[model samples]
Target: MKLKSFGVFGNPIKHSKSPLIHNACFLTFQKELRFLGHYHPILLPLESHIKSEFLHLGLSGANVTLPFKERAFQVCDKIKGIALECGAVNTLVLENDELVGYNTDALGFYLSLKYQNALILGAGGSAKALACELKKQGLQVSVLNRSSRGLDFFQRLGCDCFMEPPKSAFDLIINATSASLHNELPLNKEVLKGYFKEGKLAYDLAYGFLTPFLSLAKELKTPFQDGKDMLIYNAALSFEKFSASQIPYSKAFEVMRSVF
Candidate 1:
């Protein structure tokens, strides 16, 4: 097989673990593409150069991170799978010389959910994708956002959108916002009362470290998990497209788990 290049792209990408995980897998398998893999931090504003950079870098495939998932969708020559449903693209593969976009985030998050009644804590591209997949799984889903602007897509999907936490309790609560970056939780402490307690599950989309939101989850004695599993799961799916051969999911997970 020919050496193929791959990468992860984002604005604030100084700390992406994708490079470590993917490169480790390739190195263990003694692949020649190891040196060409990267985790690139794009400094230029995405509006003009996103597509150009993809081609200029000669990326065989790449993963999109934060703020750029939706932008990646626009640059795609074709959309497939969950990407079409969420209108977001986190995985980009060069197929037949055309860049194709896919959303593996939905399925990634779906595998981590512990319950049927889920409250997604943001309304961005990641939230939209997760909510779309959850609804497809027959879960009762609601999205709580700080503003109404981001909730438009959720509302149109017949999913409940709220500015404040609902009085009813959700069995699964997800923090899809970047609120944890500033040591802030998406919802106030009082608002989280009676939530994430007992057997409820709290999942944060940001992984590789603990966020303020997840910290509160532990403090509240709530069963919680960071997005590490979601990241690994999603990356495994992306690799299926990026790689020419059909690699077993268990084998991929085993290699990635060692790296993570």
Candidate 2:
């Protein structure tokens, strides 16, 4: 039998670690080289182009992200719990040649939360996906979102929710907003300041060190973590799905730390 093709599709995808992590799984499980991550600028109707690429190139499946997640959800022939909850899809696989969309943010949250509760900020798609994952994992969770639309979706899921018109803070704070990627703090210093304490783990869904968000976590004297853990955390399942093996999370975490 021959191997199949796979990749990650998103705007600015050249910055993604999906390719290395996906292939790393192959290396660990001894799976053949059937996967490859590619950059697909998330513009109008790019989902159709992605499906075409999958079929035309004989790819077995691929992961989707950012602006493309909603579009990918629309294209999937089958939708799973996580995808529906988040109204986004991060992982897409071809089962019986039928395209399927699955959200791994939930799984990622479950794997990452590990005996801690989370106070999530933002009510966007990423927030929704991660919220669902947290609740599903039986973790105590709360949320604060800016808009009624974001608040509605997250509230409907039955978690303690508030219109992020700004409030105090909670157990563990995770910023799922996109403001940081634009080089701006998605949250206010007031939100970041008093909430962090010495032992608490303050994390930003945005990766890398010293993200303005992560810096806040540190200045407050709290133990800080960034999206790198979440990335490598969720990435483990993504790699497993792509490579057919549960590669060492530590090893994958180390390799992708430099990339994802």
Candidate 3:
């Protein structure tokens, strides 16, 4: 049988652990299901078109990250699952010659979360997916961004949006921006301090290291978690799509988690 190939796509994808996670899952079931596949990271330029680039790469499937999730949504021949509600697509599968988009981030994030109310930092695609899922769970969701550029999306979803930090505190504070990827904090030190002081939990979607956001959380003695669990869970979902559901999600998740 021809080996199937999958990849994770992002502007700065070098830090992605998707290939390691998925490849481990592939290895686990290769004997049982006779599945042969490889997963890699594809760093694309910001100007590239996701659909065309994906086609040119000859990828069987892909996981979109950061700034490209919304772009992936636009390039899909069909959108399914939570992707329809969030208007973002993180998982892409080729089905009957049509490109199908799905968003597993929502459920993945939902599973990783332990709080009721949250204040999300950033208004990008990831923020949209998280906010959409939180609202679906009937939890109170609020968003804080440095600018109003993407706040309208949150407003339409009935989420409280802020251009600046609000005085009120929340049970959970989530960092959904790429700032931590660059080794930077999403908000000013004093502002973050206030939220971290009042917040019961801290979560950063950027994994693989102690981000500035998580460091502050540590210093302030707040319970916190990195994005590793969310990443593993979402990747398992994506792998299920890539494998045509031949690989059970529970098995995929178990193997992927062992990679960490």
Candidate 4:
């Protein structure tokens, strides 16, 4: 039998809470299974290196983050659910030597906030995923990206894509880019000026650190949330996919929280 091991692959992975979070949730299983999780910064610098590294590390599964989520979708032998819709993936599992991909971010973000009018910053995997889920829920969604390169997917999904924020306010605002991680802001003051209503929520997908986007929300006196809830909820779903076992949300949240 293959070793039942998992890992998260990313470029800047030193700060990932996945190992600590997943291990703690796995322990909640309270059963016998040789399961472990790890984090790999990168085996090789190129995105194409993921397949070889995943195989060489003998991973039964892994979570793909940052620059590799799109690459992960291309490498999978099979794709399903939101991975297919968004053309990106964050979770992978091996079955009979074939890699399979699934995207848990969309549903995870949707569940994290069930608002009607949503505005998401960035046009990467997480942005695409969240936009798709929000649309499926019949919510009005818009996407703002710095460039047009990644905006096609959002447009094809029937979402309003823009280089600038729309002229309207949104109940749910999201930072789906790593701009905050790099000490950058996703939007300009003119774009956000008075756009947020009092008590509107600003959610950042990058957790563990405050980003400039969230700082703006704070400055506006709007409510804000880091990516911790999004991480735990999506990770819980990813763990279920990897383990092929269903665990309740309360149980998974409780276990994951215990580790932090």
TM-score, one value per model = 0.90, 0.79, 0.96, 0.90
Instruction: Encode model 4's per-residue lDDT on 1-260: one tens digit a residue.
Output: 22367888887777788888787766656353444444334433653577777888788888988877888888888998768998899998887888889999987776666466888888778888888888998889888877886677888888988886678878888888878778887778657645656327888999887778778888778888988888988887887787765566556766776777
Error of 4 at 248 (Å): 4.8
Q: Highest lDDT: which candidate?
A: 3
Model 2 CA lDDT for position 211: 84
Q: Candidate 1 lDDT, tens digit per residue, 87-118? A: 78998888888898998899878765546689
Off by over 4 Å in 1: 30-48
The whole-model lDDT of each prediction reads 0.78, 0.67, 0.88, 0.78
Q: How does model 2 score by TM-score?
A: 0.79
Give the number of the best model, judged by TM-score.
3
Which portions of model 4 show Cα errors greater than 4 Å? 1-3, 30-44, 197-199, 246-250
104-216 per-residue lDDT for model 2 (tens digits): 77667656654356778776667888788777767777886666656666667777886653354466777887767766776667756766752266777776547888877
Better of 1 and 3 by lDDT: 3
State, as a TM-score between 0 and 1, how close model 4 is to the true structure: 0.90
Error of 2 at 120 (Å): 1.5
